[PDB]
Structures are given as C-alpha cells and as structure tokens.
C-alpha cells in the first residue's frame, strides 16, 4: 500500500526531474501537428525566402525540444528503477537474516531465492511502459475538454459508470492469477535447486531423466497459468470495446432532439469517439498498478515479519568465569509442538573439569548443545550462564565466547583462511597458523597450492571428510572460547589423530562438553551424564 | 543474431497464421478512407466491431505461441545443463546455474516476445506505405531509399557496446544469487558464529557492482534516444528542401507533392521505431550468451553404451589405475591400484584421512574416468554399459548421504524405473534396520522429510540411505563410512547382511569404514596410504606380517 511510497522516497530528486522532462515533452509533441499543417497548406503557392523557410525552421526547433526532453525522460526512468530494485533486494535479504531458525524449516531455499529474484523485478517493472502513457493521457483529456457543448458534457455523465463492478471483478481475477503465477515459478525454481545442488546423488542412480521430466511438468503448470492470464485480459479488452460502441450509439440515439446544426454535431464526433476509447486507458492502467502492487505481498510480509526471538541482549561482562547451569529445562520444537524432547534436565558445568554427555541416537544430545548456544528458547525452566540468563548477553559477545562444532560441519566457499577466520572482523595470520597447528590441520594445508589461500568448493566439496572436520575444529579454536562444545567431533577422523586430540583442556580454564554416541568413547571425563530418551538418568 | 531464430522454428505454422492476420489488419487500416461506404450511419459500428474481433484473435494466437516457445526453451536449457560432466558442476556453483536457467531464459523470452510483435507490425506498415510511394511521386522515392542506409551506421558501430554491458550484468546477477543461496542453506551455522553482518556486506558488494554498470546503461539509452530522433528529423526535413526546389524550378506537380508529404511523415515515424529495435536486439544477444554456451557445449565424458546383459556378476578388475582430478592435474591422488572383487567376498579398504578411499568409490560409480589403466566390470569397461543399467547394478551409500525433500516411500524408491511395490519398501527397511524408527513416526512412510534432513537424527539418515541402495538389488555394493554411528539393531542387521545373509553370494561388497569389528571379519583387507596399496591379505596375515596395519589397530 503506502510502503512502496516510503520505499522509493529517496529517489524523489531524480523523480521530480522526470515529471519536469515530461511536461515540456508532451507540450512539444502536441504543437508539432500545428506547424506541420503550416507547411503543407502553402504548397499551392509559396514564396522561397518567406515564412515557408521560417515554418520549416520553427518546426525543427520543436522537434529538437521534444526529442531531447524525451531522451532525458527514459534515461531517468531506466536508472531510477535500478535503484529501487536493488534497494528492495537488499532490504529483503537483510530482514530475512534476522528470522528465527524455525522459519527456515517451513520454507524451502529454492522458493526463498525465487521471490528474492523474480518478484522484485515484477514489483519494479510496473509503471515504466505506462507512466508515459498515463500522464500523456491525462494531458490530452485536459486539453480536449476546452466546441459545440450545449449538452456535450451529457456524455460526461455516461462516462463515469464504466461498469465499475465489472472492473472490480476483473481486478480480483487479475490479482488472483498473478499470485498463482508467482507460486508456480517458485515451485519450479525449487526443482532446479534440488537437482543441481545434489548432483552426485542424482548421477549415482542415473536419475537425470526423472529430474528433467519433473521440470517439464512444472513448466507446463506455469504455461497454463500464463495462457489463462493472457486470455482473460484479451477477453476483457474486447468486452470493454463493445460497451464503448454501445454507449456511443445510445448517446447518439438522442441526437435528433432539435433537427445547432448537423455540421456542428459531426464536427466533434471524431474527437468524442477518440476520448470514448481513450479514457478506458485511464481505468485500465490505474487498475493495473493497483493490482500489480498487491500481487507481490509475499515479499512485503517477509520484510515486516517480526521474529519470535526474545528481546536483544545488552549485558557484556569483561570477565566470564564459564559456569553453565540447567534448571529444570523443558523443550519442544516450535514447528512441531505437543511432543516434548527434553523433560526436566538439571545439571551444572564447571570450568576445571570435562563433562561427557552420552546416549543413543535420537535422544536429544544435539538439542541440548543447540539450546546451549542460545539458538532456541526452552518452554520451561531456564538455562543460566554465570548466574544470568543466556538471552541477556549480547549477540556478538555470547557467540564469541561460546563456540561449538556440529555433527557434520558446513564450509562456505572461499579461501581456507576465510573459513578458519569465519565470523571475525580481523585476524592476523599468526593466529590462524597457531589454530591450524592445534587441530593438526597444517599437514595437508602445505600440500595445496597457494598455501592457506587455496579455494574450497561449496560445502567443502574440494576436501576430504577428514580434512573438513579438522578445519571446523580449527575454526572454533581460533576464537579462543571460554565454553567449548564438541558434538561428535572425532568421528570422521582416523584412529591416530583422534587419540592425539583427547585432552581439550591443556590450559585448564575452559569448560569442555564432549558429546559421544557410546560410553567407550570417553574415558577421562570427570563427570559423565547418561541421557536416555530425552530424560537424564 | 541467427542463433536466436532456432527456438522460434518449432512454431512456424502459428507464426505464419499470425503474419497473415497482421497483413489483413495493416491493409484494412490503410484503405479505410478510400471507400467510406461510397440509423443514418452504422458504418462506424460494424467497422469497429470487425477491427476488434481480429485484434482479439491475433492477440490470442501470439500470446499462446509465445507461451509455448518460452516453456520449450527453458526445458531444453536445463536438459543440456544436466547432460554435462561432473567437473562442469564444480567450476560453476549452484547459484550461477540457477540464475542462468531461471533468470536469463525469462529475460531473453520477455525481450523476444515484446519486440517481435511490433517489429512485424511496422515492417508490413512500412512496406505497404512504400508501395503507395512509387506511384504518388516516382522521382522522390529514390532519394529517400539511398539516404535511409546512412542512418544505420551509428547503431551498427555502437551495437557491440550494449552486449558487452549485458554480459557483465548477468554475471553480477548470478554472483549475488550464489551468495544468497549459500547463506540461506546454512543458516544455523551462520547464526552460531553471529555472522549476519558478514553475509550482508557480501550481498552489498555485489549490489554496488551492479549499480556501477546500470548507470552506464542509462546514459547509453539517453544518448541513443537523441540520435534515433535527430536522424529522423534530418530525413524528414531534407525531403522538404529538395521538394521546395522542384516546386519553383521543376515541374508543376505541386498538387502532387501534397500527397507525398503526409505519407513521408508517416513513413519516417515507422522508420524511427523500427530503428529503435536494434539496441534491444543486441541486449537480448548479451543476455542469452551464457545459456547459448550451455546448449552447444560438448560434454567431456564418454557416451552411454548399449550393452545390457541379463545375467551379470560383480567381478570388478583394477589394472594399474592412476587418477588425477581434472581441476588440478599432475597431482596423482591414486597410483598403481590393482585389486579384484569377487562375488560372495567382502573387501575392506582402510587407511588414513586423505588417502583416496572415496576417490576409488567415485571411480567405481563411473563419475570420473581414470587417466591410467583399464577398469573392467565383468571383462568389459564401464562406459560400454547403458547409463540406466550400470547404476542399477552398482549402488553406493556415500560419506555424507543426501535425502531429498519428499516422502520417505518416494525417497527409498528414488531413481527406480517403474515404481516399486509398497511391500518392497518395507522389506528393504526391515533389512536395513530402519523400519524400527519409521513405524514410530505418526504417519509412517508418508512423513515428508524436510530439506537437508533437519528433522532426521544422525544414524537415521544413513539407515534410509542403506535401504535406498539395497532396494534395487545391486550387484556391487559400496559402503562408504556408513557403519560408524548406527544403532544396535542396525549394526546387527549390517553384520547379518554382510556375512550371514542367504543372498551374500549374489553380490560383491566393497567396505570402507574405520570400525575394526567389521574389518576383522572381512575376507580381504587392503591398506591404502598415499594413493598406493601398502599391505594386503587377511586379518590374520596382516597381524603376522607386522607393520602398518598392526600399528593402527594396536593404537588403543
Ligand atoms: N574435488 C576434489 N578436487 C581436488 N582434490 C580433491 C577433491 N576431492 C578430494 N581431493 C583430494 O584428494 C585426496 C583424497 O581425497 P578423498 O576424498 O578421496 O580422500 P579419502 O582418503 O577417501 O578421505 P576420508 O577417508 O578422509 O573420507 C586429498 O588430498 C583431497 O584433498
Ligand atoms: N527442525 C526440527 N523440527 C522438529 N524436531 C526436531 C528438529 N530438529 C531436531 N528435532 C528433534 O530433536 C532431536 C535431535 O537431536 P538428536 O537427533 O537426538 O541428536 P543425537 O541423536 O545426536 O543425540 C530429534 O529427536 C528430533 O526429533
Ligand atoms: Mg545430536
Ligand atoms: Mg572420504
């Protein structure tokens, strides 16, 4: 509604130039036919150096005046909507990064990229091909309404009710079919992302023909929606012209109330027949902009979606002891409620010792680690870090002190140094080489070209699984944390390396929480917690 | 420019019919004041209702044909992308490929649809306006057809500028898309490191790179709009200058140059609009440059064979196989591999991280071609077998298995020609041990798993992957680090499958794992380190022969 007005608001200086270059543009082109008639009507008899040369000279200046101001209009319009489209895309992506972790479960990644790409172009390409038409049409109806008019304006009474109910039912149908077109495009885009991203699984089963056939079915559903939208628009335009003929004949049916003469009536018949089919452009174009703006409301709902995260933290101590306490925590995932995962856990963590959490698969060990990093909020009880709730600490402070290693790590595309120093605004190569030595990752780093600046593919596709795990450990260790969480860290590694990295508390001032699938994995931990079916024993 | 006409050749019959209706509409709109009919006058009523029906008919055919062209073009581009080799999908990320398929094809189709209609409208309008020029005044039609090619010089020279700006814009659009999808796919990791500002800065860097080129496409259009309307003014004025001289010095045809003036001005109006198409044609060429490279690119992989034997055994022979990755040659990952797999026998492959165990598994699935000796399956090379038949007999699990976003019954039966039967799905899930937790779900096999298996636990995503590979009855089975985090019931089912199943003699299994319990029972153990086989033999022989394998097992 009014959001697009505030959105394009910092483009008004370039906008007010566009209506500046438009007023004198249409002014020039309306006066050109007058001087064109000045030249032609004197070809019966003309004087060589007289106003015939002046008529040509006067006509060419107004060609100069109209064409130059017309070029500056299009240049201003073409640039100003590159600015609008790139501003929309930035605000949408910035607001999409603040949402909670449960929001990304409901929506697919391919669908989100589709609205970020396709819908922003539609929401910016509405007026360009028509705003020149809109104000030119507004100018002409203003100029023409300045002849024989004893009751000419009578036609003004009949030109107000242009079957507004028929316009309203068409506007509802047009915004309906524009919504399904956007949804069908987003469904087809997800098919491309799923088949291309996971290619190695697709090629391993020889199922490339299945993914091609699925895309062909998705394209046909889009095509049937495209043809439906074009059909009703062409059907509506034909129906509108039939009514224009009807009202014109009905108005002229009362044309013999006095037969003011015949010649006076026929003089304005052409101009009346013009604006009869020329005011329909006004209601059509204005209706299009109203429907096209409201047909991309999925983007605007995303930009003003308030996440269910708590209030942002403000506490930031200069010295953290590192004590973590769980007090009767009860948790159930927000997208699938009414099914508890954790039930009444209660334990404490101390910086001097190493705590081991063991249990079977599907028990909730990684849910505990995810809740410990303030990724989710418990539905009962609370979790306390240094005698304070963990949600009161700053977002950029808490995650710099409490780091963790996931079950299967994901490495973003870029250099190895960028992945090791991920999340840090600045990190000298002294720190990176110090952390790479701790995780025993310097052995294979030297074998690659360019050293630590070599490329790593998407999701670490150009690395071994063992080498990917060592980069994740070095990435967490370079932050120098106070609380360290290890969630199945030493599984993909070989026997020799995982035995070398078993202490994790050489300094002795870090809280270490090791999470293992079996009890035999951990043997030196001071405190061992056995977690069965989501309830501590 | 002729490369764009390939996609329009499928609908030449409908386009020709639309061309006929274009000619009829153009002829009627010109010879309309010539007759004028030579309840007082319903002539305007029948004229308008006839000119509206043909407009509606012509719009219906053009819109339907343009819809069919766009849908056909997008399908062919995606088909040619998936046909390429595996190295192609590593040079280009998934963000770039999505932008080329989805964005560039829609941009090219929209530009082609909006321009082809008004080009054909104003070509037959100019041609029919020229036909009424040769008889109105013969002597002035030759001067305006020799000056007309002079206006084409400037758009021809600056035409390359438009497409060079377009290839940089489409490149910048694709790079920004790759940043967005990569951040959104790994959101829990991004939030865990508090790096939302880092992703925002990376997106803003690509957007400001777009802005520094989109200013250049606004000045270019403003300059072009001036030069495409001043040349029109020079054409129309220069006729009057010569025409004025012929009135006062030449013939007495001043009553005949009157009818030439109106037709000349309308002919000029059609020329300027027809001259305002050429910059948009070069823009469409620049937008479609990348997707036309994908279409005619020959893949660097051998074609699929034609052999499909009914009876096959899993006899795989390695004969001096050495492989180096195509994106980084002269670094031999493998070196002198030589071993055989026999049906009913389990071979265990062990070694340190980075040895190349997963590279051997990728070679055995015909993902990459070796750069050394032959790799034979039942005495015949892998590329000699059909694509849909080789991957049915040979199945694998993978180090990090991937699950697609659909129901589990559609996930276990993925890739299968035909549609397997439901009992089949339960039979494989029971065998793989996954049926214990599938029945615990409220909907059973109909639970649509989310993307990247977020709702699935650790060892559950490898139990489904094991059931998916076993449902096609493979002849060669590859287990790539699957039995490391499996439950007690699944581990017992794996041991029965590997060593106690009745169908053990039907298939040959290659086992890649660090679990010493399963390795110690294997019939052959191969130690891989540095890309070459160090020691080979049974578990007892490796203990007695001492050395590398002895040190690894006795570490705890
Ligand atoms: N796509 C790739 N491009 C280039 N080099 C690669 C690629 N994949 C792996 N490598 C390199 O090949 C070597 C071994 O790779 P591979 O994944 O086969 O190891 P592996 O021994 O099977 O791994 P692990 O047992 O740790 O899972 C390493 O030096 C690795 O960096
Ligand atoms: N996005 C989600 N929506 C609903 N439930 C989830 C989601 N992610 C995880 N869970 C639940 O949380 C648990 C994940 O922790 P878990 O798999 O037990 O880790 P581990 O098995 O390694 O201990 C699972 O039982 C799963 O049911
Ligand atoms: Mg877990
Ligand atoms: Mg591997």
Swiss-Prot record, chain A:
Lineage: Eukaryota, Metazoa, Chordata, Craniata, Vertebrata
Enzyme class: translocase
Disease the record associates with this protein: MHC class I deficiency 2: An autosomal recessive, progressive disorder characterized by chronic bacterial infections of the upper and lower respiratory tract apparent in the first or second decades of life, nasal polyps, and ulcers with granulomatous inflammation affecting the nasal cavity, upper respiratory tract, or skin. Patients may develop bronchiectasis and respiratory failure.
Record comment regarding domains: The peptide-binding site is shared between the cytoplasmic loops of TAP1 and TAP2.
Residues in the Lumenal compartment per record: 33-50, 148-153, 256-264
Cytoplasmic side: 72-129, 175-234, 286-537
Keyword Cell inner membrane in annotation: no
Entry function: ABC transporter associated with antigen processing. In complex with TAP1 mediates unidirectional translocation of peptide antigens from cytosol to endoplasmic reticulum (ER) for loading onto MHC class I (MHCI) molecules. Uses the chemical energy of ATP to export peptides against the concentration gradient. During the transport cycle alternates between 'inward-facing' state with peptide binding site facing the cytosol to 'outward-facing' state with peptide binding site facing the ER lumen.
Subcellular location: Endoplasmic reticulum membrane
Regulation: Inhibited at high ER lumenal peptide concentrations.
Keywords: Adaptive immunity, ATP-binding, Endoplasmic reticulum, Host-virus interaction, Immunity, Magnesium, Membrane, Metal-binding, Nucleotide-binding, Peptide transport, Protein transport, Translocase, Transmembrane, Transmembrane helix, Transport
GO molecular function: ABC-type peptide antigen transporter activity; ABC-type peptide transporter activity; ATP binding; ATP hydrolysis activity; metal ion binding; MHC class Ib protein binding; peptide antigen binding; peptide transmembrane transporter activity
Effect of residue 433 to V: In allele TAP2*BKY2
GO cellular component, one term: endoplasmic reticulum-Golgi intermediate compartment membrane
Catalysed reaction, written as an equation: a peptide antigen(in) + ATP + H2O = a peptide antigen(out) + ADP + phosphate + H(+)
Membrane topology listed for this record: Multi-pass membrane protein
Name of the protein this chain belongs to: Antigen peptide transporter 2
UniProtKB/Swiss-Prot annotation, chain B:
Annotated GO CC locations: centriolar satellite; endoplasmic reticulum; endoplasmic reticulum membrane; endoplasmic reticulum-Golgi intermediate compartment membrane; membrane; MHC class I peptide loading complex; phagocytic vesicle membrane; TAP complex
Binding positions for ATP per the UniProt entry: 351-359, 454-460, 514
Catalyzed reactions: a peptide antigen(in) + ATP + H2O = a peptide antigen(out) + ADP + phosphate + H(+)
Cofactor: Mg(2+)
Induction note: Up-regulated by IFNG. Down-regulated by IL10. (Microbial infection) Down-regulated by BCRF1/viral IL10.
Subunit organization: Heterodimer of TAP1 and TAP2 (TAP1-TAP2). A component of the peptide loading complex (PLC), interacts via TAPBP with MHCI heterodimer; this interaction mediates peptide-MHCI assembly. Recruits TAPBP in a 1:1 stoichiometry. Interacts with classical MHCI such as HLA-A*02-B2M; this interaction is obligatory for the loading of peptide epitopes. Interacts with non-classical MHCI molecules including HLA-E-B2M and HLA-F-B2M as well as PLC component CALR before the peptide loading. Interacts with PSMB5 and PSMB8.
Side of membrane Cytoplasmic, spans: 62-111, 163-231, 278-556
GO MF annotation terms: ABC-type peptide antigen transporter activity; ADP binding; ATP binding; ATP hydrolysis activity; metal ion binding; MHC class I protein binding; MHC class Ib protein binding; peptide antigen binding
The organism's taxonomic lineage, starting at the top: Eukaryota, Metazoa, Chordata, Craniata, Vertebrata
Name of the coding gene: TAP1
Domain ABC transporter: 316-555
Regions that span the bilayer: 15-35, 41-61, 112-132, 142-162, 232-252, 257-277
Protein name: Antigen peptide transporter 1
Protein localization: Endoplasmic reticulum membrane
Tissue: Highly expressed in professional APCs monocytes and dendritic cells as well as in lymphocyte subsets T cells, B cells and NK cells.
Coverage span on the entire protein: 173 to 743 of 748
Topology feature Lumenal, residues: 133-141, 253-256
Principal localisation: endoplasmic reticulum
Stated consequence of mutating residue 183 to V: In allele TAP1*x
Region: Part of the peptide-binding site, residue numbers: 188-233, 266-300
């Amino acid at each position: 509604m009014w959001r697009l007005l505030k959105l394009s608001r910092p483009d008004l200086p370039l906008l007010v130039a566009a209506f500046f270059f438009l007023v004198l543009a249409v002014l020039g082109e309306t006066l050109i036919p007058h001087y064109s008639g000045r030249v032609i009507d004197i070809l019966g008899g003309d004087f060589d150096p007289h106003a015939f040369a002046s008529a040509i000279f006067f006509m060419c200046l107004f060609s100069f005046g109209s064409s130059l101001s017309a070029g500056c209009r299009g240049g201003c319009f073409t640039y100003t909507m590159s600015r609008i489209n790139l501003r929309i895309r930035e605000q949408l992506f910035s607001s999409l990064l603040r949402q909670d972790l449960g929001f990304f479960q409901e929506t697919k990644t391919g669908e989100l990229n589709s609205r970020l790409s396709s819908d922003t172009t539609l929401m910016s390409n509405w007026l360009p091909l028509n705003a020149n038409v809109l104000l030119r049409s507004l100018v002409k109806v203003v100029g023409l309404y300045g002849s024989i008019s004893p009751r000419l304006t009578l036609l003004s009474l009949l030109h107000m009710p242009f079957t507004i109910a028929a316009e309203k039912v068409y506007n509802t149908r047009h915004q309906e079919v524009l919504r399904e077109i956007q949804d069908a495009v987003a469904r087809a885009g997800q098919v491309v992302r799923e088949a291309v991203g996971g290619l190695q699984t697709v090629r391993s089963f020889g199922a490339e023909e299945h993914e091609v056939c699925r895309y062909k079915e998705a394209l046909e559903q889009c095509r049937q929606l495209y043809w439906r939208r074009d059909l009703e628009r062409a059907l509506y335009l034909l129906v509108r012209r039939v009514l224009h003929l009807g009202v014109q004949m009905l108005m002229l049916s009362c044309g013999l109330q006095q037969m003011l003469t015949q010649g006076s009536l026929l003089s304005f018949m052409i101009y009346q027949e013009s604006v009869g089919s020329y005011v329909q452009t006004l209601v059509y174009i204005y209706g299009d902009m109203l429907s096209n703006v409201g047909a991309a409301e999925k983007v605007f709902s995303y930009m003003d979606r308030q996440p269910n995260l708590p209030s942002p933290g403000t506490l930031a101590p200069t010295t953290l002891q590192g004590v973590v306490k769980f007090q009767d925590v009860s948790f159930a995932y927000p997208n699938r409620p009414d099914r508890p995962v954790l039930k009444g856990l209660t334990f404490t963590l101390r910086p001097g010792e190493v705590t081991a959490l063991v249990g079977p698969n599907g028990s909730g060990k990684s849910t505990v680690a995810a809740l410990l990093q303030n990724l989710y909020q418990p539905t009962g009880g609370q979790v306390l870090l240094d005698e304070k709730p963990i949600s009161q600490y700053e977002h950029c402070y808490l995650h710099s002190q409490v780091v963790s290693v996931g079950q299967e790590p994901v490495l973003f595309s870029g250099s190895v140094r960028n992945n090791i120093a991920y999340g840090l605004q600045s990190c000298e190569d002294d720190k990176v080489m110090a952390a790479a030595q701790a995780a025993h990752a310097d052995d294979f780093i030297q074998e690659m070209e360019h050293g630590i600046y070599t490329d790593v593919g998407e999701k670490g596709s150009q690395l071994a699984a063992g080498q990917k795990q060592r980069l994740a450990i070095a990435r967490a260790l370079v932050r120098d944390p106070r609380v360290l969480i290890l969630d199945e860290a030493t599984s993909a590694l070989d026997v020799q390396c995982e035995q070398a990295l078993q202490d994790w508390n050489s300094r002795g001032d870090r809280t270490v929480l090791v999470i293992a699938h079996r009890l035999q994995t951990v043997q030196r931990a001071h405190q061992i917690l056995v977690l069965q079916e989501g309830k501590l024993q | 420019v002729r490369r764009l006409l390939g996609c329009l050749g499928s609908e030449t019959r409908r386009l020709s019919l639309f061309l006929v209706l274009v000619v009829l509409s153009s002829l009627g709109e010109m010879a309309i004041p010539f007759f004028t009919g030579r309840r007082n006058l319903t002539l305007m009523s029948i004229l308008t209702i006839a000119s509206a029906v043909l407009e509606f008919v012509g719009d219906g055919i053009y819109n339907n044909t343009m819809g069919h062209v766009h849908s056909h073009l997008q399908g062919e581009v995606f088909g040619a992308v998936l046909r390429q080799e595996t190295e192609f999908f590593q040079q280009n990320q998934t963000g770039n490929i999505m932008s080329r398929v989805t964005e560039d094809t829609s941009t090219l189709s929209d530009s082609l649809s909006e321009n082809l209609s008004l080009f054909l409208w104003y070509l037959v309008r100019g041609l029919c306006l020229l036909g009424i020029m040769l008889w109105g005044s013969v002597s002035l039609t030759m001067v305006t057809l020799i000056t007309l090619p002079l206006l084409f010089l400037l758009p021809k020279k600056v035409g390359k500028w438009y497409q060079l700006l377009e290839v940089q814009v489409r490149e910048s659009l694709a790079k920004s898309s790759q940043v967005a999808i990569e951040a959104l796919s790994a959101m829990p990791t991004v939030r865990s490191f508090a790096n939302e500002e880092g992703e925002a800065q990376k997106f803003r860097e690509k957007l400001q790179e777009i802005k520094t080129l989109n200013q250049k496409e606004a000045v270019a259009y403003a300059v072009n709009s001036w030069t495409t309307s001043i040349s029109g003014m020079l054409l129309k004025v220069g006729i009057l200058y010569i025409g004025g001289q012929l009135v006062t010095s030449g013939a007495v045809s001043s009553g005949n140059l009157v009818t030439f003036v109106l037709y000349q001005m309308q002919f000029t109006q059609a020329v300027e609009v027809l001259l305002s198409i050429y910059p948009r044609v070069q823009k469409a060429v620049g937008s479609s440059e990348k997707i036309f490279e994908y279409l005619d690119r020959t893949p660097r992989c051998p074609p699929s064979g034609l052999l499909t034997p009914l009876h096959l055994e899993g006899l795989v022979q390695f004969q001096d196989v050495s492989f180096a990755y195509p994106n980084r040659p002269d670094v031999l990952v493998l070196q002198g591999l030589t071993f055989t797999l026999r049906p009913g026998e389990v071979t265990a492959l062990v070694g340190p991280n980075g040895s190349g165990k997963s590279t051997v598994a990728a070679l055995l699935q015909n993902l990459y071609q070796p750069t050394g000796g032959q790799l034979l399956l039942d005495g015949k090379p892998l590329p000699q077998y059909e694509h849909r038949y080789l991957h049915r007999q040979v199945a694998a699990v993978g180090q990090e298995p991937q699950v697609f976003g659909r129901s589990l019954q559609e996930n276990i039966a993925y890739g299968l020609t035909q549609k397997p039967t439901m009992e089949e799905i339960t039979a494989a899930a029971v065998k793989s041990g996954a049926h214990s937790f599938i029945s615990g779900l409220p909907q059973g096999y109909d639970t649509e798993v989310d993307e990247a298996g977020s709702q699935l636990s650790g060892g559950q995503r490898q139990a489904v992957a094991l059931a998916r590979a076993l449902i096609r009855k493979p002849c060669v089975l590859i287990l790539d680090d699957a039995t490391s985090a499996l439950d007690a019931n699944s581990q017992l089912q794996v041991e029965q499958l590997l060593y106690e199943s009745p169908e053990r003699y039907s298939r040959s299994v290659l086992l890649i794992t660090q679990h010493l319990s399963l390795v110690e029972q294997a019939d052959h153990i191969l130690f891989l380190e540095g890309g070459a086989i160090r020691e080979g033999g049974t578990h007892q022989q490796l203990m007695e022969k001492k050395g590398c394998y002895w040190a690894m097992v006795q570490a705890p």
